Amino acid sequence: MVAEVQKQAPPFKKTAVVDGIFEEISLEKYKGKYVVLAFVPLAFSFVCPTEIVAFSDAAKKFEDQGAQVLFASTDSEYSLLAWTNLPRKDGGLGPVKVPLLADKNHSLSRDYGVLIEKEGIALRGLFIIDPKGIIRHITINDLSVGRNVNEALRLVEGFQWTDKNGT
Amino acid sequence: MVAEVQKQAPPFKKTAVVDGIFEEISLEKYKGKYVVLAFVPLAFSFVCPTEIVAFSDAAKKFEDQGAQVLFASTDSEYSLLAWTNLPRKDGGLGPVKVPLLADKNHSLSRDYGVLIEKEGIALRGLFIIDPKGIIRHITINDLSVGRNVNEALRLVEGFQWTDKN
Amino acid sequence: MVAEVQKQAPPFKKTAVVDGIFEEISLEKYKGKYVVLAFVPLAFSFVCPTEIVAFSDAAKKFEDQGAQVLFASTDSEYSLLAWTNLPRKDGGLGPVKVPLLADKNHSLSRDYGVLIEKEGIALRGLFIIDPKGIIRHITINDLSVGRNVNEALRLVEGFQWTDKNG
Amino acid sequence: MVAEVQKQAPPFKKTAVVDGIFEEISLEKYKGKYVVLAFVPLAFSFVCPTEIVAFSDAAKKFEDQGAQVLFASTDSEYSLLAWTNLPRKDGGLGPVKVPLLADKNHSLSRDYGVLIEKEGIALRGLFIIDPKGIIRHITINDLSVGRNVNEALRLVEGFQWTDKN
Amino acid sequence: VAEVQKQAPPFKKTAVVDGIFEEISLEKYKGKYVVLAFVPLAFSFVCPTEIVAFSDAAKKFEDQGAQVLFASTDSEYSLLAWTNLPRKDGGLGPVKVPLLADKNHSLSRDYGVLIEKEGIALRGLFIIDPKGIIRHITINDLSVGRNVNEALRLVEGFQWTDKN
Amino acid sequence: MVAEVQKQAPPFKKTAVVDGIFEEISLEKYKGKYVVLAFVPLAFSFVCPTEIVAFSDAAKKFEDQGAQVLFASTDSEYSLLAWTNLPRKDGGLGPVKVPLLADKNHSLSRDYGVLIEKEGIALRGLFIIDPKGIIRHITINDLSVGRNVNEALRLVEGFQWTDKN
Amino acid sequence: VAEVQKQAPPFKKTAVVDGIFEEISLEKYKGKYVVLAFVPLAFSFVCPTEIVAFSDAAKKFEDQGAQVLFASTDSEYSLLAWTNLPRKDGGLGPVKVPLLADKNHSLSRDYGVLIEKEGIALRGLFIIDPKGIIRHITINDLSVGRNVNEALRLVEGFQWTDKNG
Amino acid sequence: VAEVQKQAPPFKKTAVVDGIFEEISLEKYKGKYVVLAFVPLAFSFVCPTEIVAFSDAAKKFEDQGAQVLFASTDSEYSLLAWTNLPRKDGGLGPVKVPLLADKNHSLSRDYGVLIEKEGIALRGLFIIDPKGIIRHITINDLSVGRNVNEALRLVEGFQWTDKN
Amino acid sequence: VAEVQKQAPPFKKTAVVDGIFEEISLEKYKGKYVVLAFVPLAFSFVCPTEIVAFSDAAKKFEDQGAQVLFASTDSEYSLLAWTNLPRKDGGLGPVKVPLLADKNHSLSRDYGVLIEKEGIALRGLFIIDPKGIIRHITINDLSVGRNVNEALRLVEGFQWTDK
Amino acid sequence: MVAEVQKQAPPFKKTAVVDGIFEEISLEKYKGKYVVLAFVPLAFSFVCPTEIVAFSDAAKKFEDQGAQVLFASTDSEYSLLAWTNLPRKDGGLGPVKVPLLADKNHSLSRDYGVLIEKEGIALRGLFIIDPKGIIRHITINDLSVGRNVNEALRLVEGFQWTDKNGT
C-alpha cells in the first residue's frame, strides 16, 4: 500500500498535536473535504520553519477552498508539542493553525513513499487528496528547498473546479 | 529501477524530435546541467497544450539558468513530429524549443513511475534532476490540472543556490 | 491467451476512428461475419501507406464477401484521427473506409502475438477470423514488405466455401 | 523454442526424400540462401496435392530468386517416398523437385508452432527464412484452403530488395 | 504405462477396416480376448509377412474368442493407401484385421513401445483378457518378428486358467 | 534405471547357485555372448518346475546358438541351493544345467521391471540380451501360464542372423 | 519405525504354523506379551540353535503369558520346506513357534532391522506388552546370537513392574 | 539481537555531547565497560530523574573504567533541544553522558527493546565488557525505573571476575 | 520467547517444595506477582548465597503479594538431593521457595535463558504481574549474582502503580 | 546422525567424572578397543543403582577383554560428581570404576536414539561399538527393568572371537 496519483490514499490514524493537546487524527475524519497532507523532516532542526508557518497562516484560505491542511513528521507527539510550546523568538515553532501528526512508528511516511529508511525521517512530500479519498497530486522535494503555499491552493481550486464541471 | 528523490535518476536513451528531425537523447548527455523532465499524456489530444507551450516559451530562461527542459510522451517520434508540423491555428502544437521524446515501449514512463498501465499513457509527472543525476524534486498531477512553469524555475534556482551555500 | 489457427480469437474492445469520430469496437460486434484484422504500426511514418489504402479501396469487396476489415496500431485514437485528417498530398493517410483501432496499452498486439516489446509497435500481422470467432488464417510480415489485398479476399472466399460444404 | 518473425528459426535435422532416396536435411545446409519451409497435414490424404505441385513446378523460379523450397509433414520418409512413387493419375503425388521432410517425432512441427497435438499433424504453415536464419514471414492456413506460390516469390523478392537498400 | 496384471490403457483410435475408416476402442471388445500388436512403419522396405500371418489367422483367433488388432504411428490415410497398394507392387494388399492409426502417439506411449526420438513403435504385442487386464507382453526389436502360434497358445492358456 | 528393448540392459552382480556351489554372476561375464535372463516366482512353490526343467534340458542347444541361459528369483542362494538338493520325486527341483540367481534385495527384479513390490516376487519375465549388452526382446507372462523354450531359441537365432548383417 | 515406549508397528503376515499357512497379526495377541524375533536366512550354513532354543522354551513363554514369533525375509514356501527338512539333514525340523514370511520386507523395514543392500533382517528381538507397547529392543550383528533367558527375564521383569506401584 | 555471552550489536549513531553533535560507536569504547541505557521519549510528561541519577554518577562510572551512554528514538535535534530546555521549564537540562539519536530504530531493534507498533524503546540497560561481550541485560516496563547502584555493582562484579 | 509487556510463557514443571514433589504452573499463581529466577547448575562449585538470600526473603515477598520460584535444568531428584545436602557439607540445605526441574529445557528456552550448546540456564529473573504480564527482566552472566532488594523494590513499585 | 547396527557410531566429546575429577571423554580416545556405552535415566533417583554397580564391579573383566565401559546420563558433571561423593549407605552411588558422562545438552542421547524429548532423560540403552567404531549391538530397555552385565561380556567376547576367525 504505497501512494499513487489516481489511487485511494493510504488510510491512517495518528496521534497529533491540535491546539496544544493530543487528538487522534484519521483521514476518514475529513471525508467530504480535500485534505492536504504535508511532511517535514525533523522538529527543532536548525532550518527555520517558514514553510510550516506559511501554511499555518494560510489555514483559513484552505478552509475557504473546502480543504484541511495536516502536517506530519517522524517525531513523537511530545517532541512536536514541545516544539509548539517553544516560541519562535526562542528558536521553536510557536502555536499553529494546523494539526501536527506524530508518525513515530514510520507507517505513515512509509505508506506515502517519503521515508528515508536509513535516516528515520520523511522527505518534504505533499499530497492533495480529494473528498472520496483519491490522490490527485504528489509533490516531493529534497530537504534543501521548500514548497509554495499558493501551489497547493491553486491545485485544490483546480481540482474542485474540475470535480464540478467536465474536467 | 523506480525514481525517488535523493536517488540517481533512471537512465534513458530515447528517440526524440529536435527541430523537426530525430536525435537519440539520453540523460547522460546533460550531465553537468540541471534537467527538467516533464511528461504529457497524448499528442493531438483535444485538450489545448498551453502547458507544453508555457514550458516551450521558457526553454531559454531554463537554458540561461543552466538547465534543460525535456518533454516525453508515449507516442512515436512520427506522431510527435507530425504534431509539431501541424500548427496551432489547425489544432496541433507548432514548432517547439524543447526535445520531444518518444517513449513508445513505455520503459521511461515505467521507470519514472508515471505510466498508467491499463491506458498506455503517462501522468503529468515532472522531475528535476541535478548535474550529478540525482532527483531533487518530483511533481505528479492527475490529468485534470496542469503544472506551473515558475515552480520549476523557482525549484531549479532553489537547488542551485543550496548547491553553492 | 495468444492467437492460434483453429482456436478462439482473443476478444477485444478498443477505441477506434470510424469516419472521423471515435467508436468502441469489439470483435463480438461482428459475430456472424468474417473479420479481417490487420495491424500496421506506426502512423505518420515516412513510408507511403499504400497497404491501408488498398484495403480501404476494397472495403466494399470485403463487405460483399460477408467480411469486415479492421486496422489496428499502437497509436492513440488522436494520432490516428489526425492521420486521417492529414491528406495524402501532405504526407498523411486521408479518410478511409475501415475502422482504425488504437491499441495504446498494447494488449491487442500482445494477445495477437505481433507486438515488438522492445520497440512498442506491431508487426504487420493479418488475421482472418470466422463468424464463430475462430482463427482460420495468420499472416505476419517483417516490416520491409507488405500484404496483398487479394490474398485476404481469396482466403475469405475459400473459408466460406468450405464452411458451407467440407 | 517457438518460431517468431524477427527471430532465429529453430534449427532442424530431418530425414527427407530427395530424388526418390533418403538424405538428412538441415537448415544450416542452406545458410546463405533464403529457405521457404512449408508444411502439409498428411500424405495420401483425399485432398489433391495441387499445392505441393505448384511449388514443385516453381522450384526453379525460387532457385533463380536465391531460395530453396522445402516441404515437411509428420509422415515417415517411407510413407512420403511411397507417395512420390504413386503417380497422380493413380491418386498419389508423383515425383517432385523439392525435398520432403519426415517429421515423425513431431519436433519440427512443434518448434515451428504448427502441430495439432491432439491430432498428430501439422497445419499448413509456411515460413520464409533469410540467409542469416531469421524468420521474415509466417503464413498459417487452416487445412481447408491452400497457399499461393506467388506470394512466397513476391515476399522473397521483397526481402531481398530490402536486404540490399 | 501398461503392466501385466493391471488394467490396459483404454484407447479410441481411427482405423482402417475393410478399406474405410472406423473408430476402434478397447471397450468395444470387452468380453473377448484382444491381441494388440504394433508395427511401425507402413511402406517400409521390410516385407510384411508378419502382418499377413496374423491376417490369415484372423479366423483361428476369432474361434478362440479373441480379436487381433494392429497399430502403427502412421495416419489412417497412409495405412489405407498401404492396403490399396497390392503386394506385386510393393504394398500390403487387403487384410482381415483392423489397422489403427496412432498418429498422436498416445497409444504407443501408453503401451510403452514408442521410441520417442524416432516416432515409431517397437514390435510389441499385448494380450488383454475380457475384463481388460493385461495377461502377457512381448516386445521384439524391429529386426525379427513374432510367432502367430504363440499368441494362440497364450490365449488358449489364459482361457483354460480363467476357468479352473 | 528400467529395462527397455534397444537400450543397454541394467547391469547386475548376483550370487548364484551353479553346480551345487555359489558363484558371483554378472552380465559383464557373458559379454560377447547372447544371454537369456529368465525370472521365476518362488522356490518350493506348489507349481511343478517344468518350465525351468525345459530350459535346463535345452541348456546345450542355447550354448550351440552362442547363448547362456540364466534363471533368477527373489529367494536367497541358500533357499535356491536347497531347492536343487531336494530331488523332484521329493517335491523339489533336482540339479540343473543353468545358474540360479538370488535376487534377495530385489534390485534385479526392480531394474528389469518384473517385481511385484507388494508381494516380493518376480513375474515370469524373460529378456534376451545381445553380445554388446542391448536388450533385443522382452516377454513377461502373468503367473498362470509359462514360456516356450523354442521361442527363445528362434529369437536368438533370429538376432544372430540379422546381426550378421 | 519401532521405538521403546511407542506402539509397535502393526503387521499381518503369512506364516508357517504346524506345517501349514496361517495369517498372523499382532492384533491377534493383544492381551499377551509378544516376543518378535528375526533371523537373517533359512537354510543358512549355521545350525539354527537360536530358533531351536526359543522353540524348546515355547511353553515357558506360554506360562509367562507370552507368545514367541519368528520372522525372516524368506517365503512361506522356503520356510515350510525348512521345517520339512529335518536337522540330521541340515534343516530346522518342526518347531513350536510361528515362522513369518516377510517377503516384501515391510515388517523388517518397519521394525528397523532390514539391511537394504542385502535383503535380510538383522537379529533383532522386540518385546511388546499387552497394550502393544514396545518395552525392549535387542539388535545383534549376525556373528553372535541371543539368549533365550534374557527374553524370559525381561518379560518377567515387565510383568512384575506392570503389576506393582 | 543482543544476548548475554554474545558480542554486542555494533552501532554508530549521532549523539548530543556537551550541546553539540558527535558520532558515537561502540568501537570507540573498546577496552572499557559500556553501560548502554535506553529511555522511551524526550519531553514526555514523566520526570527524567532516572537519566539525572545516571548523569550524576557519570564520574563514579568513569572511575570504575566504564562509560554510560543513553539512547532514545528521538532525533539529535529533539534531544539537543531537550538539554537546552532547563528543568525549571520542563526539560532535562545539561548532562554528563552522550545522548544517542536512534531515529531509524536500528539500535533499539538490534538490542531487542523497540516496541514496533509504537516507535519507542523500552527501558533496557545493557552492560558490555571491554571485548564487546554482553555480560548483563535489564529491561523495565515504563512505570518503574532503574537503580544506578546495580549498574555500578555489576560492573565492579564483572571486573573482579575478569581478573581471577 | 518472553518479553516485557507481553504474556509470560506458560509452564507446568515438577518442583521440589518442602522436600517433596509438586507440579507447579504459572496459572497456579494468577492473581499474585511471581518472581521466576533461574540458577544454572545444582552442586556447582559456586555458592548458592543467591538462592539463600531469596529463600530468607520469602516472607517479605509473600507480604508484598508475590511468590518467588527458582528453576534449573536439573532433575527434581538432583535438586532434592541438593536440599538434603546441608551447607556445612557443600550443598544448599532446605529452602522456603519451590525449585523447578526444567529437565526438558522448555522453560529455559521459552524464557530466553538457555545456553543451547551447554544445557544450562543463564541467571535470568522475571517479574510477572497478576494478569501474567512480564513487567521486568534481568539476565546476568554466570560470574555475578542478583540483588534481592531490587526484586522487592520492583514488585512494590509495580503494585503501587498496579497495571 | 542416528545410531544403527553395522553403521559408524556417532562421535562424541563429553565432560565426565573419572575418579572424582572431570575429564573430557570422546569415542576417538578408545579407537582400537571395544566400547560399551550405557545410559541411565537420572542421578539420585529413588531406584538403587545395582545396575551401574554391577558394571562398575566388572570394569576390569571388560578391560581384560579389550573393552571400555562408559556410562552416560543427562545430568551435569556436578550432579554426577555429587552422586559419587554421596555413599550408598546414605542413598547415593559411591565411587565407581567407570567414567560417568554428563550429556547436559542432550546431543549424545539424541544421536544414539535414547532421549525421551518430552522428559529430558535417556532410556536405558546400551551400545557395543567395535575397534573401527562400528555398532555391533543395541539394547534399549524401558525404565522399569535393567540390563545384565553378563550379556555385555558375552556379546563382546562373541564379537572378538568372530573378528579373529572365519566363523
Chain position carrying cell 564391579: J57
- Resolution in units of Å: 2.6
CB atoms within 10 A of CB B150: 14
Looking at CA atoms only, how far is residue D21 from chain C in angstroms?
34
Q: Are H103 and A81 in contact (CB < 8 Å)?
A: no
Please, are residues E96 and E58 in contact by the beta-carbon 8 Å criterion? yes
Task: Please tell me if residue J47 touches chain G, with a CB cutoff of 8 Å.
Answer: no
Q: Are C85 and C94 in contact (CB under 8 A)?
A: no
CB of J90 less than 8 A from some CB of I:
no
What distance in Å separates the CA atoms of residue E145 and residue E44, rounded to the nearest whole number? Answer: 14
Sign of the dihedral defined by the CA atoms of residues J81, J85, J90, J96, in that order:
positive
Q: Is B64 exposed, middle or buried (0-12, 13-18, 19+ CB in 10 A)?
A: exposed
CA dihedral J18, J22, J26, J27 (to 10 degrees): 10
In a domain, J8, yes or no: no
Q: Other C-beta atoms within 10 Å of E31: how many?
A: 10
Neighbours of chain F (3+ CB pairs under 8 A): E, G
Q: Residue F5 is placed in which grid cell?
A: 528393448
Domain containing residue I154: 12-160
CATH number (domain holding residue A135): 3.40.30.10
Distance from C-alpha of H6 to C-alpha of H129, rounded to nearest angstrom? 11
* Distance, CA of D9 to CA of D5 (rounded, Å): 9
Return the H-helix or E-strand segment holding A125: strand A124-129
D87: CB partners within 8 A, 6+ apart = D94
Give the start-end residues of each E strand in I93-141: 99-101, 114-115, 120-121, 123-128, 134-140
Residue A114 in contact with residue A39, Cβ under 8 Å? yes
- Tell me, what DSSP letter sits at residue F83? H
Q: Is G140 on the interface with J (CB under 8 A)?
A: yes
Alpha-carbon span D26 to D15, nearest angstrom: 9
| Element containing residue C52 per DSSP (H, E) | helix C50-57
**Cβ contact B136–A145 (<8 Å):** yes
Residues with Cβ within 8 Å of residue H131, at least 6 apart in sequence: H30
Question: Which contiguous run of DSSP H or E holds residue F160?
Answer: helix F149-163
* The residue to which cell 526481402 is assigned: D159
d(CA G14, nearest CA chain J) in Å? 27
What is the 3-state composition of chain I as percent helix, strand, coil, each rounded to the nearest 5?
Answer: 25, 30, 45
Inspect the interface and report whether the beta carbons of F75 and G75 lie closer than 8 Å.
yes
Of the CA atoms within 13 Å of residue A65, those in its CB half-sphere come to: 26
What b/e string do you get for F95-129 counting C-beta neighbours within 10 Å, with b at 16 or more?
Answer: ebbbbbbbbbbbbbbbbbbbbbeeebbbbbbbbbb
What is the DSSP track for I62-96?
A: HHTTEEEEEEESS-HHHHHHHHHS-TTTTS----S
Q: Is J154 on the interface with G (CB under 8 A)?
A: yes
Give the number of other CB atoms < 10 A from CB of residue E163. Answer: 6
Rounded to whole angstroms, the Cα distance separating I156 from H143 reads: 12
In chain A, helix, strand, coil percent, each to 5?
30, 30, 45
The C-alpha cell of E87 is what? Answer: 503386394
Sign of CA dihedral I69, I70, I73, I76: negative
Element (H, E) at I106: helix I106-110
J-I interface (Cβ pairs under 8 Å ≥ 3): yes
**Entry field: residues in chain D:** 165
End-to-end CA distance of chain A: 28
Q: Is residue F23 situated within a structural domain? A: yes
DSSP string covering chain E: ---TTSBPPP-EEEEEETTEEEEEESGGGTTSEEEEEE---TT-SS-THHHHHHHHTHHHHHHTTEEEEEEESS-HHHHHHHHHS-TTTTS----SS-EEE-TTSHHHHHTT-EETTTTEE-EEEEEE-TTSBEEEEEEE-TTS---HHHHHHHHHHHHHHHT-
Q: Residue A115 — φ and ψ, nearest 5°?
A: -75, 140
Residues in chain J within 8 Å Cβ distance of I117: 105
Give the bridge partners for D23, in sequence order.
D16
SS3 D35: strand
All residues of chain B having their beta carbon less than 8 Å from the beta carbon of residue A140 are: 5, 137-138
E110 burial level (CB within 10 Å; 0-12, 13-18, 19+): middle
Cα E72 to Cα E36, E43, G66, J146, distances in angstroms: 11, 12, 65, 72
d(CA I38, CA I124): 5
Phi/psi of residue I13, nearest 5 degrees = -140, 140
For the CA atoms of G49, G50, G56, G60, what is the dihedral angle to 10 degrees? 150
User: Pairing mode, if any, of strands D135-141 and D124-129?
Assistant: antiparallel
Q: Per the domain annotation, does B2 fall within a domain?
A: no
User: ∠ CA E64-E67-E68 to the nearest 5 degrees?
Assistant: 115
CA atoms within 13 A on the CB side of H148: 14
Residue H81: count other Cβ atoms within 10 Å of its Cβ.
25
Angle between helices I148-160 and I49-56 (to 10 degrees): 40
Residue B106, min C-alpha distance to chain A (Å):
18
Determine the residue of chain A that is closest to H105 in CA distance: A120
Q: Is residue I25 part of a domain?
A: yes
| Secondary structure of residue G109 in the 3-state scheme | helix
Residue E57, in any domain of the structure: yes
Name A164's Cβ contacts closer than 8 Å, sequence gap at least 6: none
- C-beta separation of A36 from A42 below 8 A: no
What is the rounded CA–CA span in Å between residue I155 and residue I129? 9
Q: Which chains lie within 8 Å of chain D at 3 or more CB pairs, if any?
A: C, E
Least Cα distance to J152 among J84, J75, J96, J70 occurs for: J70
Closest Cβ–Cβ partner in C138, C144, C148 for D162: C144
Which positions in chain E touch D21 (Cβ < 8 Å)?
none
| Dihedral in degrees, nearest 10, Cα atoms H71, H76, H80, H81 | -110
**H102/H15 Cα distance (integer angstroms):** 9
Residue with cell 544445557: I119
Residue F116 lies in a domain: yes
Say which residue the cell 526392480 belongs to.
Answer: F110
In terms of DSSP H, where are the helices of chain J? 50-57, 59-64, 77-85, 107-111, 149-163
Contact criterion met (CB below 8 Å) for C50 and C57: no
Q: How far is CA C100 from CA C75, C76, C82, C93, in A?
A: 10, 10, 12, 11
Considering only alpha carbons, which residue of chain H is nearest residue I143? H161
- The number of folded domains in chain C is 1
Cβ atoms of I138 and I124 within 8 Å: the answer is yes
- Number of residues assigned to chain H: 164
Number of Cβ atoms within 10 Å of the Cβ of I42:
28
In a domain, H4, yes or no: no
Is the CB of residue E28 less than 8 Å away from at least one CB of chain D? no
Contacts of C88 in chain B (CB under 8 A): none
Buried b / exposed e along C101-139 (16+ C-beta atoms within 10 A):
bbbbbbbbbbbbbbbbeebbbbbbbbbbbbbebbbbbbb
Q: Which residues of J touch I89 (CB under 8 A)?
A: none
Which of F114, F103, F116, F97 is closest to F76 using CA atoms?
A: F103
In 3D space, the residue among C17, C49, C4, C18 whose CA is nearest the CA of residue C147 turns out to be C49
The residues, ordered by sequence, that sit 6+ positions from F42 with a Cβ below 8 Å of its Cβ are F73, F74, F75, F121, G75, G77, G78
Method used experimentally: X-ray
Contact H129, H33 (CB under 8 A): yes
Q: Pick from C4, C17, C151: which is nearest to C77 by CA?
A: C17
Instruction: Name the residue with cell 517432385.
Output: D96
Residue I5 located in a structural domain: no
Collapsed DSSP state (helix, strand, coil) of residue D69: strand
Cβ contacts of D155 on chain C, cutoff 8 Å: 141, 145
Closest to I127 (Cα-Cα) out of I99, I108, I155:
I155
Q: What gap in Å lies between CA D124 and CA D112, rounded to an integer?
A: 11
Q: Which candidate, B124, B78, B45, B104, places its Cα nearest to that of C74?
A: B104
Cβ–Cβ of C140/D138 closer than 8 Å? yes
Specify the 3-state DSSP secondary structure of B59: helix
Q: What is the SS3 assignment for C45?
A: coil
Name every residue whose Cβ is closer than 8 Å to that of residue B14 and which is 6 or more positions away in sequence: B24, B25, B26, B72, B101, B102, B103, B108
CA distance A40 to A101: 10
Name residues whose C-beta falls within 8 Å of residue G108's C-beta, 6 or more positions apart in sequence.
Answer: G38, G71, G73, G102, G114, G120, G121
Taking CB atoms within 8 Å and a gap of at least 24, the contacts of A24-29 are A25/A70, A25/A99, A25/A101, A27/A129, A27/A133
Using CA atoms, how far apart are residues A144 and A136, in angstroms rounded to an integer?
25
Beta strand extents in chain F (DSSP E only): 13-18, 21-26, 34-39, 67-73, 100-102, 115-116, 121-122, 124-129, 135-141
Indicate yes or no: CB of A141 within 8 angstroms of CB of B137: yes
Biggest CA–CA distance in chain C, Å, is 49
The Cα J106–Cα J72 span in angstroms is: 11
